[PDB]
Write a protein that binds this DNA or RNA. Sequence first.
RNA 1: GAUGUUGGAUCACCGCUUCCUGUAGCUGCAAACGGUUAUAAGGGUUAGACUGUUCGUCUGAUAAUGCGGUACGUGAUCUGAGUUCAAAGCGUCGUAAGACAGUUUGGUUUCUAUCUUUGUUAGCAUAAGUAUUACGGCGUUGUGUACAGUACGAAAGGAUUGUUGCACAAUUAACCAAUAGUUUAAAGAGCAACGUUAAUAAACCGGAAAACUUUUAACUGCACUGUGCAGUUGCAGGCAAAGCAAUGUUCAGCUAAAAAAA
RNA 2: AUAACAACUUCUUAACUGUCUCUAUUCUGGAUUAGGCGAACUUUAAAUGCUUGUGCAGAUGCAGGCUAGCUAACAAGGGACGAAGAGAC
RNA 3: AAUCGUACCGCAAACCAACACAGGUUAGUUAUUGUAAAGGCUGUAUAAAACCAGGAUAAAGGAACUCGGCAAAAUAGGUUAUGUUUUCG
Lengths: 113, 306, 121, 173
Amino acid sequence: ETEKEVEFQKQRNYPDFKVGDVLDVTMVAAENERKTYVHRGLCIQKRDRGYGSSFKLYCVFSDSGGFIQHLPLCMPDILDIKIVGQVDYKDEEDLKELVESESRECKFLDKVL
Amino acid sequence: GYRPAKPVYPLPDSIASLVEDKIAELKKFGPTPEPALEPLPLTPDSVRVGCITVKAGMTHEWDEHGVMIPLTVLWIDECQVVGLKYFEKNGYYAVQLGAGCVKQHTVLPQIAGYYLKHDLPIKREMKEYQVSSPEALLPVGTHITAAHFVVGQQVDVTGYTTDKGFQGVMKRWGFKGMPASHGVSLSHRKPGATGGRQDPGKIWKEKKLPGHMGDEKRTQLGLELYKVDPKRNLLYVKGAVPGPRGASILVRDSNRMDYEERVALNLPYPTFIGSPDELPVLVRKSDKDPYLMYKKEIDYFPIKWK
Amino acid sequence: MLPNYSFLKVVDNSGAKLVKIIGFYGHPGKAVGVGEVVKVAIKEAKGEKVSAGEMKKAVIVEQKFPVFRPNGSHFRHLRNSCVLLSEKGQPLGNKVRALLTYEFIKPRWSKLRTITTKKLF
Amino acid sequence: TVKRFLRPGGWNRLNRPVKERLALIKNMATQLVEKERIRTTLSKAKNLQRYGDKLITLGKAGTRESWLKANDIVRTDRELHKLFTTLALRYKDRQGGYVRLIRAGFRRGDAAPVAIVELVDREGELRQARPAVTPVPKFSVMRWVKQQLDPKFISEPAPLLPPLVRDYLKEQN
RNA sequence: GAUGUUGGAUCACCGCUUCCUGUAGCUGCAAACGGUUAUAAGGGUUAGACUGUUCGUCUGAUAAUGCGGUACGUGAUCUGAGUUCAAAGCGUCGUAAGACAGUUUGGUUUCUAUCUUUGUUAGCAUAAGUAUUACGGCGUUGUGUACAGUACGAAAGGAUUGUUGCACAAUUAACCAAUAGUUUAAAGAGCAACGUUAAUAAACCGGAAAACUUUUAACUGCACUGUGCAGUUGCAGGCAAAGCAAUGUUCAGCUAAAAAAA
RNA sequence: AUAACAACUUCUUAACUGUCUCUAUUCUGGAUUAGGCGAACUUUAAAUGCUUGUGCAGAUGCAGGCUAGCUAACAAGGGACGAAGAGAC
RNA sequence: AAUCGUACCGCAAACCAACACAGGUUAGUUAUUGUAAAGGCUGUAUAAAACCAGGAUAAAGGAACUCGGCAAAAUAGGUUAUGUUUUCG
Ligand SMILES: [K+]
Ligand SMILES: [K+]
Ligand SMILES: [K+]
Ligand SMILES: [K+]
Ligand SMILES: [K+]
Ligand SMILES: [K+]
Ligand SMILES: [Mg+2]
Ligand SMILES: [Mg+2]
Ligand SMILES: [Mg+2]
Ligand SMILES: [Mg+2]
Ligand SMILES: [Mg+2]
Ligand SMILES: [Mg+2]
Ligand SMILES: [Mg+2]
Ligand SMILES: [Mg+2]
Ligand SMILES: [Mg+2]
Ligand SMILES: [Mg+2]
Ligand SMILES: [Mg+2]
Ligand SMILES: [Mg+2]
Ligand SMILES: [Mg+2]
Ligand SMILES: [Mg+2]
Ligand SMILES: [Mg+2]
Ligand SMILES: [Mg+2]
Ligand SMILES: [Mg+2]
Ligand SMILES: [Mg+2]
Ligand SMILES: [Mg+2]
């Protein structure tokens, strides 16, 4: 596991983000002929488990409602991650209530590129 | 167990000498064959020997197409030829392989005696593989390493599964049970009926009932060999392998492969000749598109429009 | 993963609001997901195109259950919705208020890919 | 060694609910400190040995945080004072293994197994324990190996006040 | 001096008079869809509304939704809606006590397995290991699509063939890197499917045993009601800056070691 | 006919849910393992296999065809026309 | 001013139930805001089977269960502009 992690770190350099931060993630859609898109959303869960690390991204749209994604951190499809902001919360219960009641999470209405 | 021993009687003096002369003549054997290690041609009906490995665990990786692949890691500590069988003495040709290492004072003298007599280490496990011709026999002491296999082929794995203990019908055989409510009385997880009435009047053999579960020999066929690391004697195989960590696993060329596929792979035969230390790590290449269904209609769709 | 006899919300402008699944096609198993066509009964409709009590075909567009991708990721919605279809396989409306996902990049969903507002791809 | 179970912490159930289980173990731990030797059943002894080792670790810490944790375990003020003052200095150099367990057969009535639990360095000890710091021969492979792997190996007991503290006091005064 | 009722739940063994998946003829068989006869019992034989029902009517799908025997299989495994005790109402019959063979509401379901049958496991009885062959168990499934708008046909309509290719479903076998659920003396634990991998076969699994080989003919035990693929620098204890059943380690317990000199 | 009232019988709506698709994990107690203490139903005699045939007409015990290590433990409940009450119909 | 009761048990192992029986048994008094003074009482040795009983949590669906929403779950409480029915309460 450590051998693979060392190789990955030489290829990518991501920031040390936490739960509650707003992130911009660049990904490749293999289904759509490997086209690049940029997603903006809130980080609601982060798991630090070595090569199996992952996180969840949350966003809300104008009419369609909430949308959640689960993304492996070492997946090659992800190209870049950046921190753009922060959303305050009190505890897990407060964060869960915010997710269920979609509100003030419409950073960008659609995906770029 | 065994049946009680049968009585024996001394032979008459007019027949004892004749019997002993004939028995000794049948038990007299010629010199042991001396196998030679040399490449041989592969024929339409020719089986190779397998190997004994240890299960390490599971991991995952991403391939050239960006797809996640679950993997099982198998380690080959030390596998050697420890004996031979031939027609004159046994009636058929086979190769015996051993693996592992144990201390002398932890095994019975019967087991240790065989290995000491031929200057071989005491090995924890021993298994036999049958060959097709005398020329397929390997010299005693030959090592079977990870280079014995070609990356990208299919293999079969055998072993004993994980012990589960004493389990009921719902978990052991998938019986449905009975309702949780509506008047049921103390029979929620019970097997129900086990027969009829006066006819047939008995319970059939192998009727499914509670019992111990989890320690039995099972074989998985058609697993793919993904990566090979000859220097460290590691094999990466896609899929699940029976047994817990540390289980002894037998690896063999899959019988699902045809002769043409074996010819294309150019499998070593009788085995790899050389030093596996100076070999690189190889990953199989798949000339397939896992996302083809998004450009062409190949998926399953039951409805015909219009 | 929607079992039979589930309720769905209509996200087209044909007039229907609430439908109930009453059958499947082919052999999909015990549950259906995004991209499958089912038979539904209209429970609440306010319009002239459709009326309550009719039976129509529909396609699942959104679901709350995880949808897995070959790369190891998945996504989830916060509602279950569908779009009504005609016997020829075309939508009964002209505006869909939903987020289209990768399932509809396939050639057979060209019409949906044109009338949908927001797309994930 | 002490067996590990599947419950949180891997402890014994002692045939009791968790609430009664914790009340019992705390009382026995208090008595072990007071008397330093106790005879009981095998299951209560195995649990007490592992629990007792972790209670000594808190005493060696000698911090406000450690005392708060221990104050909820020990039942008597006198026993708690002894833990932080007397036992703390006793086991300065010993790294683990502050309690030993030896089996003592079966009882008379219910024929349950029994054992004896005792501290491993004191007057009245059942046996003589190995020194807290193992001496190293001057011309042994062991000495060379420790130099290559752990240059900070401790070979003899250290004084209560190290030279740096002594030097600072001398300079100050 | 007692062989528990109808229907269903749960789990079954068998026959063929074959509903589907097969093979070979005939046809008022161009193709497609059919009709009929002979042969074939390996696998399969759906989810719901009404009704105590068997049955029956209907709805959406399905390759198709076959029949019969087994105390009209199956209550010392479950159910009690109907029927078949004591209460009560209505209608009809009887002067009345009452009757219905009509209807309506309500109404107690016991048993710690001795023998035989069956699933697992240990002890004892001819040392242990490898084991050809033989014997026994299991049963090699189904749909859609591409090769083709091609053969056939005025048009319309629309195929056969395959140790075929691809996707999916059921069944069976396991598996825990990842995903979902679950335990506060908590967790990158363990067990799990809603998750992952594999199978359409002379393959796979179980016990006895010839022969061969080895031995001074072998024989407890790590807290041992999870596993020991761990027996003395052995270890899932303790301790550390550590990924926490891993790495490091001077302590604990089981089981303490050495001729001097040249 | 009838407002109110009903642990009465019938149907429907809202919501809710392991009733169900389809179950999984877990806590407490029993079972299960060890020491001590110590019952009951039942018992013509027993060393008590399968299958077809036979027969007071549905056989552990009779005839043919088969069946060969030994005694128990934990578990299930087909048969012994299993036990209980001199059938109520 | 004589005479009889005064020990001990009394929601109980001492009274009524054949028992040291999860049942039955009258009156008078006492602490306590979200708590609770006095007094009274106390369990053979373990644990990582099936199964059974009494609890807890549960993805997506929500009566598809069943003779029957049996059992379980569920914002359950208070004040209302307006409307309906009344024997006018
Ligand atoms: K059988
Ligand atoms: K595996
Ligand atoms: K500690
Ligand atoms: K047929
Ligand atoms: K009433
Ligand atoms: K029985
Ligand atoms: Mg169930
Ligand atoms: Mg009962
Ligand atoms: Mg129950
Ligand atoms: Mg026939
Ligand atoms: Mg029948
Ligand atoms: Mg019957
Ligand atoms: Mg019965
Ligand atoms: Mg009456
Ligand atoms: Mg009358
Ligand atoms: Mg009259
Ligand atoms: Mg009632
Ligand atoms: Mg596991
Ligand atoms: Mg530890
Ligand atoms: Mg017990
Ligand atoms: Mg007979
Ligand atoms: Mg007979
Ligand atoms: Mg009579
Ligand atoms: Mg749920
Ligand atoms: Mg219903």
